[PDB]
């Protein structure tokens, strides 16, 4: 009858979980096994997936509540502790075990995958989230392709 039945307790993280990013290079890779091609704002054919370059690094200290008490002085204001006496409304204790996010550079190789027979000189790079919209917190997305032959088509 309690929340045991339908919620689940899990370790918290400041990344707020994570998501895949889908790359697409519409003007270069031949569109993968069921994708139709578009100039549609989002829905370009995916060419490879990664987690976003943004991960939780585990952090532990005792004296976390002590750090919070020292901040209770050195902040010079009470705005986050309006009820210092009320034990239910009291500012909650800082976790001893906790996370920080690190935004890390990432470098990857995807599969050998098929390539349009002739290439226009103006070309396109896209990074999109699981919702297929473009992540604004991107700097320096890049692609590097070594072309090669798969198989003859001329018989």
């Amino acid at each position: 009858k309690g929340v045991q039945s339908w919620t689940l307790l899990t370790t918290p993280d400041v990344t707020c979980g994570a998501e895949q990013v889908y790359w697409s290079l519409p003007d270069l890779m031949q569109d993968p096994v069921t994708f139709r091609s578009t100039q549609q704002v989002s829905n370009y054919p995916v060419v490879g997936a990664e987690l976003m370059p943004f991960r939780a690094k585990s952090f532990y200290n005792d004296l976390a509540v002590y750090s919070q008490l020292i901040r209770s002085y050195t902040s010079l204001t009470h705005v986050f502790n309006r009820f210092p006496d009320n034990q239910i409304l009291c500012r909650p204790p800082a976790p001893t075990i906790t996370t920080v996010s690190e935004n890390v550079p990432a470098l990857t190789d995807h599969g050998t995958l098929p390539l349009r027979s002739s290439i226009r000189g103006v070309q396109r790079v896209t990074v999109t989230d699981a919702r297929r919209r473009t992540c604004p917190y991107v700097y320096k997305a890049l692609g590097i392709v070594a072309p090669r032959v798969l198989s003859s088509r001329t018989f």
Binding site: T38, Q39, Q40, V41
Partner: protein, 50 residues
């Protein structure tokens, strides 16, 4: 010269998809040419209302 079968002289296509941005519009059509038709593209035009 002319077919004695039932066939439209003029066709009209409704967009199958369309997208908007702050400064542009984009619409996708399936232009269908039936099994004994031939279409001279000079006859085609985008009829727009607004």
């Amino acid at each position: 010269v002319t077919t004695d079968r039932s066939q439209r002289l003029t066709l009209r296509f409704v967009p199958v998809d369309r997208e908007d941005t702050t400064y542009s519009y984009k619409a996708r059509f399936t232009l269908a040419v039936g099994d004994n038709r031939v279409l001279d593209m000079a006859s085609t035009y985008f009829d727009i209302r607004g």
